[PDB]
């Protein structure tokens, strides 16, 4: 089997992407944030504290003829941005882009933190990291990918995120029309439950490539590119008037600037992030200070190749017995 679903930016900045997901019988379609940096499929629901729901579409298990309470199971998750959610668990039928899993754990939120309530466009998350990070207690649950894997034509999914445009998540096949050149594969460590890999270096604009190992995760659920402070300083030094602002919480730059590209290495291959991808716009409405899309990972404890990096590539998440990542230009 295979599946193919379009993923759509939630706003004009590509802060996140939403993908429709069919849950239950008859289908309830919710727009989920597919997150390769977490392992829970959780949804706003009929159980969510009413004051914490503001425009989201909710999953109502009582209206699904295939929903079953996973008795005694609870979940609770905290993300890198300080957001959180928790609740109980149902099993149900879940379909993505025509690919169906029966008996998927669907984590029903009783509580969500303010950042979820305030984002009316995201109805929940669908985790695509390794199932070792799933938070369901006392019986850990599998991701949608892990449950689908054995049925797939190939044990892979691909992320093809758009810049200010829709893109695609495919399950079970490589679309050889969706990228240019060849795919370069690189080793993954699953030791922390993430799609963790080592980039071979970087360049700033038309500058020389610096060969240096940068361990990080491929995380579709993180907006920005978080790299070591040396790398990030080197990048922003090439933008007149850019500075790190403790008050704003990262590097800002004059909105009048033209940003340089940023290149990252994947083995001997190179993925170029155009400068425009690094502009996250005014820090507040009408400001002439703009927020940068490359930020320091210092204090986060891991480098994160989030959407700013991933949307410059066609990315293969290879879930074979020895997982690997693939990157192609597109
Ligand atoms: Na922000």
CATH superfamily of the largest domain: Acid Proteases
Strand proportion: 35-45%
Query: Going across the major beta sheet, what is the strand order?
Result: 18-17-12-13-22-14-21
- Computed over alpha carbons, the radius of gyration is 20 Å
Shape: globular
The CATH topology of the largest domain corresponds to Cathepsin D, subunit A, domain 1
Helix content: under 10%
Q: What's the total number of strands?
A: 24
Structural class: mainly beta
Bound molecules: sodium ion
Helix-strand topology string: EEEEEEEHEHEEEEEEHEEEEEEEEHEE
Biggest beta sheet summary: 7 strands, mixed
CA distance, first residue to last residue: 25 Å
Protein name: Endothiapepsin
Keywords: Aspartyl protease, Disulfide bond, Hydrolase, Protease, Signal, Zymogen
GO biological process, one term: proteolysis
GO molecular function: aspartic-type endopeptidase activity
Provide structural commentary.
This protein has 330 residues and is mainly beta. It has two domains: 5-174, Acid Proteases (Cathepsin D, subunit A, domain 1); 175-330, Cathepsin D, subunit A, domain 1, CATH 2.40.70. Helix content is 7%, strand content 44%. It has helices at 114-118, 144-148, 229-236, 307-310, and strands spanning 3-9, 17-23, 28-35, 41-43, 68-78, 84-96, 99-112, 124-127, 156-160, 167-171, 184-187, 196-204, 210-218, 225-227, 243-245, 250-254, 262-266, 269-273, 279-282, 289-292, 294-296, 303-305, 314-318, 324-328. A seven-stranded mixed β-sheet has the order 18-17-12-13-22-14-21. The protein has a six-stranded mixed barrel with strand order 2-3-8-4-7-6. It has a four-stranded antiparallel β-sheet with strand order 15-16-20-19, with no helix packed on it. It starts with a strand and ends with a strand. Bound molecules: sodium ion (NA).
């Amino acid at each position: 089997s295979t599946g193919s679903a379009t993923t759509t930016p939630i706003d004009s900045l590509d802060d996140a992407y939403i993908t429709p997901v069919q849950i239950g019988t008859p289908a309830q379609t919710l727009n989920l944030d597919f997150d390769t940096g977490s392992s829970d499929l959780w949804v706003f629901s009929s159980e969510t504290t009413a004051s914490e729901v503001d425009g989201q579409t909710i999953y109502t298990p009582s209206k699904s003829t295939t929903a079953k309470l996973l008795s005694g199971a609870t979940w609770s998750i905290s993300y890198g941005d300080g957001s959180s959610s928790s609740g109980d668990v149902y099993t149900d039928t879940v379909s993505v882009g025509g690919l169906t899993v029966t008996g998927q754990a669907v984590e029903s939120a009783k509580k969500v933190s303010s950042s979820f309530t305030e984002d009316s466009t995201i109805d929940g998350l669908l985790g695509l990291a390794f199932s070792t990070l799933n938070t369901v207690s006392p019986t850990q649950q599998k991701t949608f990918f892990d449950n689908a894997k054995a049925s797939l034509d190939s044990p892979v999914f691909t992320a093809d995120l758009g810049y200010h445009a829709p893109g695609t998540y495919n399950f079970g096949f490589i679309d050889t029309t969706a990228y240019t050149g060849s795919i370069t594969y690189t080793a993954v460590s699953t030791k922390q439950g993430f799609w963790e890999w080592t980039s071979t270096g970087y360049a700033v604009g038309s500058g020389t490539f610096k060969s240096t190992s940068i361990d990080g995760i491929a995380d579709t659920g993180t907006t920005l590119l978080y790299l070591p402070a040396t790398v990030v300083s080197a990048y922003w030094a090439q933008v007149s008037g850019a500075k790190s602002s403790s008050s704003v919480g990262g590097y800002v730059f004059p909105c009048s600037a033209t940003l340089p590209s940023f290149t990252f290495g994947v083995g001997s291959a190179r993925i170029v992030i155009p400068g425009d991808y690094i502009d996250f716009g005014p820090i507040s409405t009408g400001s002439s200070s703009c927020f940068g899309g490359i930020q320091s990972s210092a204090g986060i404890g891991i480098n994160i190749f989030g959407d700013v990096a991933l949307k410059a590539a066609f990315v293969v998440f290879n879930g074979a017995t020895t997982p690997t990542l693939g990157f192609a230009s597109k």
